[PDB]
Structure 1
Amino acid sequence: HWGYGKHNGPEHWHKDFPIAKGERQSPVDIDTHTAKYDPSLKPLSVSYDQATSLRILNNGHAFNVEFDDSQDKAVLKGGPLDGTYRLIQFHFHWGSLDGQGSEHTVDKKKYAAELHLVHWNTKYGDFGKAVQQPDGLAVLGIFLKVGSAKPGLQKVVDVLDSIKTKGKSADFTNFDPRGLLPESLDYWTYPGSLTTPPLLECVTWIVLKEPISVSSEQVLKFRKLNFNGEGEPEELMVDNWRPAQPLKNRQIKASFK
């Protein structure tokens, strides 16, 4: 149903998902001058050393690397969070050109792509319960800029050939998500939602200020993915991002000054 085309893109979402015009929708523009430094903000605790990746699959919207979240293998704690959040999957949003692709912007600036490491609040038992809570999910957002190649990203880039079309999946075990992290864990944080339908407002967004760079050839491989399934007319998977939403009654807190 929903997609990123003129006929079923972000502008049409509200018809099937009314929360699209809700009070805490993401992504948002991060205005750095009016964001508030908060000294009571704890540092992030990202423990991804016991992470266990399982699959990589094209879902017609993006490609997702899924992880085993049956136990606290890769968790997120600290920062503005209270409780442990488990990594269940990560995905990217990218554009058809280097000047677009990220969902969140910084002072209106768009990056080439954006990585979202999705975590769910373990106090809720399972992911399905978590998406029914205002503090059910924590998504770590990381910006990707085009520059030098990101070593930890190549393994993902290589397997894209086997998951070109919608519905395809491939085994993708022993992948270390720590290769996708910037050097600094400084961040901005605000209450928001999923950036794609069902557009649920259960997310505490933690967007890192430091982006990671990837070569144009690495992000180039992203653009050869297909929205369509095999045997269907080809649709390049590009621009799978949602425009910034009004901040409304919200303030973005910074962990740095």
Structure 2
Amino acid sequence: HHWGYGKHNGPEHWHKDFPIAKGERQSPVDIDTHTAKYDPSLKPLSVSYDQATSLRILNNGHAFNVEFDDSQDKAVLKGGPLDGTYRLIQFHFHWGSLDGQGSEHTVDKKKYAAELHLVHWNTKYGDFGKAVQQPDGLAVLGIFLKVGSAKPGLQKVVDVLDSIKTKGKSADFTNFDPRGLLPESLDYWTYPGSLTTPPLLECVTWIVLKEPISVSSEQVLKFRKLNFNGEGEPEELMVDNWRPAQPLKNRQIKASFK
């Protein structure tokens, strides 16, 4: 029926409706640190989020997205392995039902409690929908979350969750500053890959930061209270909305550091 993360419509079934699931550049992947190659020609990333305009938060039935105004070069990513400017359109998380799982990418097979994806689209393409028809159409910044100390900057997101508990609900969500979600270091791994949810388009340049951010147990706990279901439908908690690691195939993971 429609895709999800359950036993009957889970990642193992996606290929039936989206054959690209068994493609050559699928994400996420396991990051083998001993095989990733340091590339000294990679430039430092340039994250310019001071003019960011958040608009809304929405429960789309698979996760919650915070959306941004992308009509101008307000919040952009450049440098790193990228050519051109990429505009932030939305961010969302993947998390688990337990602290030992929830990330999509793994590092030497290590799974984190969650993973944040900041999705950006290549401005040369004019709009999001055009960017997803190109091999260099998107850039996703991935950040691992480990449970430890609370992250002050995440608290405003945590607090609005109650209001978008069920699928289809949205809430105004202005003046949120994504800078409060970044780790101190911008060292990263990069590889060519895809979106991790259907349509699984292979248009992404992945930029996975080495340094995880800490979140508190209570922060994570509130994510686990969301619902996959719509209002008035039987309750199915929104947990484990992550795709397992895919074969690397003919791809090389590059490191911005050694």
TM over 0.5: yes
- Measured in 1, the distance between the counterparts of 2:54 and 2:151 equals 19
5+ long unaligned stretches in structure 2: none
Q: CA deviation at 1:74?
A: 0.2
TM, length-normalised to structure 2: 0.99
Q: CA deviation at 1:193?
A: 0.2
Q: What is the DSSP-based 3-state SS (H/G/I as helix, E as strand, rest coil) of the residue aligned with 2:160?
A: helix
Q: CA deviation at 1:210?
A: 0.2
Identical aligned residues as a percent: 100
> Any idea what the Cα deviations from partners look like across 1:6-47, whole Å, max 9, x if unmatched?
000000000000000000000000000000000000000000
Matched, 1:46 2:41: no
Q: CA deviation at 1:58?
A: 0.2
Partner of 2:223: 222
Partner of 1:242: 243
> Any idea what the Cα deviations from partners look like across 1:93-139, whole Å, max 9, x if unmatched?
00000000000000000000000000000000000000000000000
Q: What is the DSSP-based 3-state SS (H/G/I as helix, E as strand, rest coil) of the residue aligned with 2:25?
A: coil
- Measured in 1, the distance between the counterparts of 2:153 and 2:57 equals 15
- Measured in 2, the distance between the counterparts of 1:9 and 1:204 equals 25
Q: CA deviation at 1:198?
A: 0.2
Q: CA deviation at 1:236?
A: 0.1
Q: What is the DSSP-based 3-state SS (H/G/I as helix, E as strand, rest coil) of the residue aligned with 1:205?
A: strand
> Any idea what the Cα deviations from partners look like across 1:209-247, whole Å, max 9, x if unmatched?
000000000000000000000000000000000000000
> Any idea what the Cα deviations from partners look like across 1:124-160, whole Å, max 9, x if unmatched?
0000000000000000000000000000000000000
TM, length-normalised to structure 1: 1.00
5+ long unaligned stretches in structure 1: none
Partner of 1:14: 15
- Measured in 1, the distance between the counterparts of 2:170 and 2:130 equals 26
> Any idea what the Cα deviations from partners look like across 1:184-214, whole Å, max 9, x if unmatched?
0000000000000000000000000000000
Q: What is the DSSP-based 3-state SS (H/G/I as helix, E as strand, rest coil) of the residue aligned with 1:240?
A: coil
| Equivalences, count | 257
Root-mean-square deviation (CA, aligned residues, Å) is 0.2
- Measured in 2, the distance between the counterparts of 1:67 and 1:219 equals 23
- Measured in 1, the distance between the counterparts of 2:236 and 2:50 equals 37
> Any idea what the Cα deviations from partners look like across 1:70-102, whole Å, max 9, x if unmatched?
000000000000000000000000000000000
Partner of 1:78: 79
Equivalent runs, 1:144-155 vs 2, <5 Å: 144-155=145-156
